[PDB]
Amino acid sequence: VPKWIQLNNEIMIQKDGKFQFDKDKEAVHSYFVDYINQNTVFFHNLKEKLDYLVENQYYEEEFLSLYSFEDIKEVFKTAYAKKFRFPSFMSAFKFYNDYALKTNDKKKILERYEDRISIVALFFANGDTEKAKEYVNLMINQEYQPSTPTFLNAGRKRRGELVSCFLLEVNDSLNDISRAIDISMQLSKLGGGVSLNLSKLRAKGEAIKDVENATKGVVGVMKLLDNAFRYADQMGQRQGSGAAYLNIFHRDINDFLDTKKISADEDVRVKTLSIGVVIPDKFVELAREDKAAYVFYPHTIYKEYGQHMDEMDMNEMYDKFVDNPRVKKEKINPRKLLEKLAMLRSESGYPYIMFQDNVNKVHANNHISKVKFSNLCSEVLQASQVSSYTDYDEEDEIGLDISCNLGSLNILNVMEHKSIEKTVKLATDSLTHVSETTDIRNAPAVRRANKAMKSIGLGAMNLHGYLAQNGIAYESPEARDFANTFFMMVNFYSIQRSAEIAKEKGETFDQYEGSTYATGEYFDKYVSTDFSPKYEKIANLFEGMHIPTTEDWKKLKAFVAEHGMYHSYRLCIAPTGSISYVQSSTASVMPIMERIEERTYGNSKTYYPMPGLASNNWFFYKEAYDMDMFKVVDMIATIQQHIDQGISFTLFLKDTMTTRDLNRIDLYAHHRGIKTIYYARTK
């Protein structure tokens, strides 16, 4: 057992009835005195290091060639002047095991934290030394964290794509299904998580070229996609991850759900394909009134109306579908379906729940399309247009496939530096740069939507960490007040930066003129409701920072009207799995699952306390499972009212609560305006 691992395991050993949290710090020192410095490759000067990394195909020549060597050296010096120290052993371990650049033999460390941050900053700035230094100060203060793809791969020649969330629309044809399989394989090859909408696909027992009972339904397509994702597994590094979304009014919805049951046969169950269910308000109304619902055959609806079932508003179309004899449908019990969803989420955490009307009643780009499905993490909610992939030697009709750009603000570090505006604007600029530098040659609709929509996702993390280190309970009304104010400022500065980029470049996102930004509707609740903190403690937390008022929001609305907005979407709160370790932050805006988490690496045990955990804030670091899920829903809705896309919202349940409690949480989330529900993790 290594010395740093012993020093880390000494945390659980209680002295005077208290955990030895400070010992973790010592572990970090050991982890750097015994391992990191010994296995870190050192060079006589930075010029030699850069030459070795470029020549050995570690870095890219293009992004480094935009700067003189003096500017690169100045950026590296700015990164190293902070003298950044990892506060916990797990932060440094996760960085140097997951993100630090290693030799081809994987035994030496080529990149420190400062080196990786400097390289990512130089990639972000695209030739501006001052902008690169600003990015270096942003990331070394740990105010902003690029996502795992961006942070890991920026500036590296041997790399995947910087985007890892992809949403694909699948049209109801064999050509479109095969193209979707191909694109899923290509994007998993790039290292991205792929979500596919299967609602347009006709159900099982439908007609193919006017022969009856011929379609295999969406379950056969799910089997094909599951095989494709198993095959494309990042060159045998990570398990291929894919998601499939189906509307709850699709007839296959039960069989869809049956793919996640343990009792399902081998020809029914898909193991590497996550599933999500899109639930329109009509289904919730039918379940609430206990009226029996109807699941429709999509192809009959398409034949009758010329549009797909998921392309029209089910609230106004459901009665017409039911009363139409030419539309084929099957009787179901919506309450039974809700109970089945709750039971499946209890067993396996699936499916993801998308409340379609909750997403689309605040969607700014409904003119382009309504949000029909979400991503693999159930937080990307954007307009998508299906593509018509025709036969060979025939021109395809390329639509819009969602691929947003991830990046997370560290709420604790951002707010302690009183730099919400600067961090949000710099993160928006970096996300815009990464979106502009993304070029996928095997996903035509993804590339077209990236060029047109210019959608980015700016998330936040360390919400619970910040609240606990400031003596605020996550379920307290003060925490929701802080979340409201902080995320309203984040939205304000994100919109301001998007409008500034649109003014500078002279271009907005495609079909912006029809958006609620152009019409000013988006700013309605912002020009009438003041989002300043209602509690003195939160106001003192925001001291030293200008909180945008209704007049500031009116000025921003006028600015957007005059200049437009560059990004169709700006904010989405991703789970932030492993980057939260490196940043010493709690994951996403979720409450912490455990105060101290026990992990097993190799044959060794390691202990990670939550950041800033001590005896004084032990009570404020309440575990997520012990919390009331209604108050967690309230906080997530408070944040969601300022996020244009969704939030990865995992439910944290105890083994005692039943499926009725899960359904109640889901229905309260639907009532409170929650757009997506990610997971049902049972303790």
Partner: protein, 289 residues
Amino acid sequence: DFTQMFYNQNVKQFWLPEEIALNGDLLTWKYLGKNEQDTYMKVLAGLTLLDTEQGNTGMPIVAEHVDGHQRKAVLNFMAMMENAVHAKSYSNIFMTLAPTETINEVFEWVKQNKYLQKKAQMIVGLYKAIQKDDEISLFKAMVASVYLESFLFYSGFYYPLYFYGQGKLMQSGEIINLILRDEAIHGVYVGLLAQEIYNKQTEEKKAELREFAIDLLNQLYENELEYTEDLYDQVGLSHDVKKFIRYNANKALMNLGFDPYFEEEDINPIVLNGLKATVEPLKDDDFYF
């Protein structure tokens, strides 16, 4: 006063070897000396034989003669574990670690090994001597079964535990620990049934039954010593294993309500280190807040 709690414990302990992936032991197995691998294969083969007969013969025959549907259900469950779970798990281990020829050879070796044949002859003989409505013949077979569960398995269990305790062959070791956990409760349960019969006897009859139990233990013990030397001398562990089997002989006697027979000794500390959701319907009030 006890069958229901044993029923619940037995069914809650239910497992299958396929739950444990064994390919993780491949390297620590490859690294053992030829002597070590030989002893290991033979040890598990001896265990397989014991469980084969405990499942095919011992547990079913005791089940037949014990009165009460719940007692029979426990004994039937234990019988199933012996041959459908325990005996089979050893083949899972063999099929992972060893080539077919080595597997064939070790099963041929059990057939011709004189100590293993002697112990099977003695134990199975007592099982087959049970006479209907004759509680004394039943007691004798239950003593034999306790000695199989709580004493005889242990010359075999030593070696997987010895490796597990050093961080070697830990997947196979996990299987063995599950088997051992089962046998411990099987030995206690059968011990309690034996005590029931013993407690019905006159003092004179009891004195004879203690003589039977002690004579049988000594006879099995002397044979087990020779078996232990035969297997463990090539790996240098015979004396250590002997201490372990004496320790477990005392546990078998205690399961039968008798005083320990061997003096306490220090056991190798390595071996000591080797040791749907509820559904409610949705009410109309759950849709309003």
